[PDB]
Amino acid sequence: FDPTVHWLFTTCGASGPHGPTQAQCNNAYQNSNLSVEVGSEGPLKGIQIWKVPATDTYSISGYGAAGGKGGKNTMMRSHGVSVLGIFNLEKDDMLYILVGQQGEDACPSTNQLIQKVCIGENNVIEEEIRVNRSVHEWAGGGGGGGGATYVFKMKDGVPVPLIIAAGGGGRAYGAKTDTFHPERLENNSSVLGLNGNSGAAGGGGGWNDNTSLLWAGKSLQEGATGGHSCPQAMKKWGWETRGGFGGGGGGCSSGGGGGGYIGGNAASNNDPEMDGEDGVSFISPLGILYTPALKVMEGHGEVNIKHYLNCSHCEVDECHMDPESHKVICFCDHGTVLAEDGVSCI
Amino acid sequence: FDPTVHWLFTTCGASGPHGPTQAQCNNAYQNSNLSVEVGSEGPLKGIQIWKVPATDTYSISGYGAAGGKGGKNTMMRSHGVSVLGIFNLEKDDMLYILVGQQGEDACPSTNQLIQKVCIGENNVIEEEIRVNRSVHEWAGGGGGGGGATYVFKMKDGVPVPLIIAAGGGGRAYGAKTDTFHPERLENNSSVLGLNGNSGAAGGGGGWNDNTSLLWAGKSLQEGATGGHSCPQAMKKWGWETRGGFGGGGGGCSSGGGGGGYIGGNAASNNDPEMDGEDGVSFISPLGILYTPALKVMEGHGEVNIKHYLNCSHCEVDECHMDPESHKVICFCDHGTVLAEDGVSCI
Amino acid sequence: MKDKFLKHLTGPLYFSPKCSKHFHRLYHNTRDCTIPAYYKRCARLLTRLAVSPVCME
Amino acid sequence: MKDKFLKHLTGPLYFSPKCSKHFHRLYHNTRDCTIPAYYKRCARLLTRLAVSPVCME
Known part of the structure; x- marks a missing residue:
């Protein structure tokens, strides 16, 4: 297998509450x-x-x-x-x-x-x-x-989840800070993938739930369409902040909740200072969690699929590929140096 | 007349080579x-x-x-x-x-x-x-x-120009600098408002000209639609950089020319380092040039129309309105100070 | 807070007596320099006026 | 030119052996830290790993 072959999935140029x-x-x-x-x-x-x-x-x-x-x-x-x-x-x-x-x-x-x-x-x-x-x-x-x-x-x-990377919540109108909560991750499939709580703003869409409110993001199994804005904003001045495709909750004076396996919550009232919560990420028991859930993306999401570099051959199961067109290098922990064998550490 | 009343014209949310x-x-x-x-x-x-x-x-x-x-x-x-x-x-x-x-x-x-x-x-x-x-x-x-x-x-x-604010030229692929040329302004209506020269990239559209090349921006009197990209860019990998609505010239490996009264030129060849030139601005003889043509806008253009404050009531024909809910303050040149009269400075 | 803020971005540029007439107009009569959020635009305007041929005499 | 550049945005963060095991994966096996243009993303990832409960022991 060519080590550089990967498949990168984007939004295909689509944006907003609907998919490409x-x-x-x-x-x-x-x-x-x-x-x-x-x-x-x-x-x-x-x-x-x-x-x-x-x-x-x-x-x-x-x-x-x-x-x-x-x-x-x-x-x-x-x-x-x-x-x-x-x-x-x-x-x-x-x-x-x-x-x-x-x-x-x-x-x-x-x-x-x-x-x-x-x-x-x-x-x-x-x-x-x-x-x-x-x-x-x-x-x-x-x-x-x-x-x-x-x-x-x-x-x-029946759809069976493998990876769910949560979406970020929306910021409130008057967000006076930048504090963000720890990333929640779910690995047990018996926990229900429910939507987030909706107040004035819409809660995030979950993995499997029933969505009635228009401003709440839909769950994955009912479309995962981002929710509309709260009716009051649209009726007053048409200020529309829709949730992103993938269960994003629609906005109000408060921020909308992000999508995920469990949708992010939204403020119960129309608090102009409460941001929406991020969703809950999911890793299937049919797979191995490689790295912890971490907040990175500043725009649309993405998926990167590549062949997993099999590295159970050397003493340390962890390894990497040298970028300058070289062979697999197995890494050593603490201060141990790679041996001349190129498998063990010393 | 209410001094704060103004009419602001935007692109109405439109973007790209066509108008709203x-x-x-x-x-x-x-x-x-x-x-x-x-x-x-x-x-x-x-x-x-x-x-x-x-x-x-x-x-x-x-x-x-x-x-x-x-x-x-x-x-x-x-x-x-x-x-x-x-x-x-x-x-x-x-x-x-x-x-x-x-x-x-x-x-x-x-x-x-x-x-x-x-x-x-x-x-x-x-x-x-x-x-x-x-x-x-x-x-x-x-x-x-x-x-x-x-x-x-x-x-x-027959269209009669009053104000023409030129569009900026497109940057080349390998633009290694950020030097920009002085703003050209035209006040004589007998100078023809022709399109810019088109090479691989499209020249900017003018006030009144005939446009044949698809990558050249159209002139105002034939639609002022931004030009397409050069055919080679679209044929090889579909890399499309269209000119903006208002006569913007389409892009290539070189930058496209901006629109104006006279369209901005483009490089004769497909130079990957030659930026497109800005158009030529126009001020009608039926109007008074208030301030010189200056490069400001970082995105879409706009128009702001307001009632002109009559500054001819004081000795200096320059005045302004105090923002903090006050009356017209006449302007004093050099280091003169407005007297108790408030019509002459000394 | 209201004038030094522009100077922190545009720099302490020089002006001529002919340059001052246009400077006052650009400073008090345009929307770029009279709306705080547009401060960057204002800066650019002033900067360009510095390199304009009328102020280069 | 390739490692101190990330440190200028992330900062001198500490790690544990499990934190180091995850750091290696995030540093050599993700497009965030293996594509220079994505350096900012890489920084964020590392920053988050610093505050992750595994490294917070």
């Missing part, structure tokens, strides 16, 4: 080693179907999408999580890959009344907060939740 | 003091039509769009020019306003083969330059030219 079309993925993957099938209708719409080229051990790296920004574009958005896994895949296996799309930012806006709020020349929200300490009329301004990245398979009809 | 639709401008101008009519077909397609509310002296600030970036997103793009003018407009005059759209950047690309070139993991262009000192096969990577902003009127059905 077949033409978009054909255009994004033109002149590459990757060819996918994208469903056009039903709950599988926007999900790329890939055929495993050979029966082998594959490393699958999932990256969730980042959440949207709040009213002031000065606080960094919540980054989507990365989950690395090692799986054994048979030839002609079909992998269903949803690449999570970024949650929409509050600013900038093509609507000029909202754009005035974005540049600080309209402070109706600030006056509303100073007079009531709660936003009820001038709702809106929180970013939508980022979509999660799902890599799964259809074992006898 | 009526629905886009209705959505962008919702809950504002601005209502325009956008043509849907013919050479006036994408151009906003505004009705002058009262007969008065108006300051019109036009801002052209910036050009696209080159292969490496490390060199700053060429900024669109701003032209300020003072005009006397009668009531119910119709102003035709084309807001120039930004020229497309080479990177990032939704196509993954091009995205490899963008992140430095594919160097076919560098090898081609090293073994031929000219790009003939792997063409592409230069930004499209930015579109110009046109404010004009229809006298007897």
Whole structure:
């Protein structure tokens, strides 16, 4: 196997609450080693179907999408999580890959009344907060939740998750900090993949749940479409911050919840300071967790699939490939040096 | 007249080589003091039509769009020019306003083969330059030219220019510097508003010319649609960098020319280092040039129309309005200080 | 806080008596220099006015 | 030029032997840390690994 051969799955240029079309993925993957099938209708719409080229051990790296920004574009958005896994895949296996799309930012806006709020020349929200300490009329301004990245398979009809990299939550309109919570990871399939709690903003979509609210992100098995914005913002001034494709929760004055195996929560009320929670990532028991779940992605999510470098041949099972076109180098822990044998450490 | 009343024209959320639709401008101008009519077909397609509310002296600030970036997103793009003018407009005059759209950047690309070139993991262009000192096969990577902003009127059905703020040229693929040329401004209407020269990349569109090449930006009176990319870039790997709406020239390995009264030129050959030139700005003899043409805009262009504050009431014909809810403050030159009269300084 | 903020980005550039007339217009009558969020734009404008041929005499 | 560049963004972070085992995987087996243009992503990854509960013992 060529060590440099990898398959990279992107959003195919799609953005917002809906996934890419077949033409978009054909255009994004033109002149590459990757060819996918994208469903056009039903709950599988926007999900790329890939055929495993050979029966082998594959490393699958999932990256969730980042959440949207709040009213002031000065606080960094919540980054989507990365989950690395090692799986054994048979030839002609079909992998269903949803690449999570970024949650929409509050600013900038093509609507000029909202754009005035974005540049600080309209402070109706600030006056509303100073007079009531709660936003009820001038709702809106929180970013939508980022979509999660799902890599799964259809074992006898029932979808079976393999890797789920959570999407980041949306930032609130008045997010005064940049503190972010530890990445939650789920490895037990008996834990239900439920949606996040929805308040004024929409909670993130889960793996398998029933979604009724329009501003809540859908779960994976019902489409994983990002939720709309809260009705109050749209009715007041049409300030739309939709959740990203992949279960991202729609925004309000509060931030939307990110997608995941378990969707990220949203504030119960329309708190203009509460960001949405990131989703819960998932690693299947049918695979080995390579690296812990870590928040990395600042935009859309992605998937990277490559042949897993089998390195049980040397004493330390961990190894790497030398970039300057060399052979496999097995690494040594602490301060031990590689022996002349090139297997053990001393 | 309320001193704070102004009308701000944007691209209505449109981007790329074509102008906004009526629905886009209705959505962008919702809950504002601005209502325009956008043509849907013919050479006036994408151009906003505004009705002058009262007969008065108006300051019109036009801002052209910036050009696209080159292969490496490390060199700053060429900024669109701003032209300020003072005009006397009668009531119910119709102003035709084309807001120039930004020229497309080479990177990032939704196509993954091009995205490899963008992140430095594919160097076919560098090898081609090293073994031929000219790009003939792997063409592409230069930004499209930015579109110009046109404010004009229809006298007897013939367009008559009032303000033209030139669009910035596109950066070349291998732009190794960031030097930018002085802003050219035209005030004599007898100078022909011709298109820019087209080589491999497309020259910018002018005020009034005949455009045959597809990669050249169209002139204002034939649509001002941004030009396509050079055929070689599209045939080899589909690397498309179109010129912005408003006469932006399409990109190649070289940068596209920006729009203007006179379109910006492009390199005669496919030089991977020659940026496109900005267009030539225009100020009508029917108006007073308020401030010189200056490169400011980093994205799309815009138009700002407001009532011109009459500064001729004091001895110095220069004045301003104090932001903190105060009266007109007349300006004093050099080091003179306004006296108790507030009309003359000493 | 209101004027030194621009100077931190544009630099202490020189001006001529003819340059001052345009400087006042660009400083008080344009939207770039009268809206704080657009400070960067304002800087660019001022910078360009520094290299304009009228201020280069 | 290739390792101190990441340290300029991440900082002098400490590690444990299990933290080092995960650090090697994140450093040589992910496109974030093996593609120079993605250096920022790499930094974030390392930063997160610093605050991960495994390394927080």
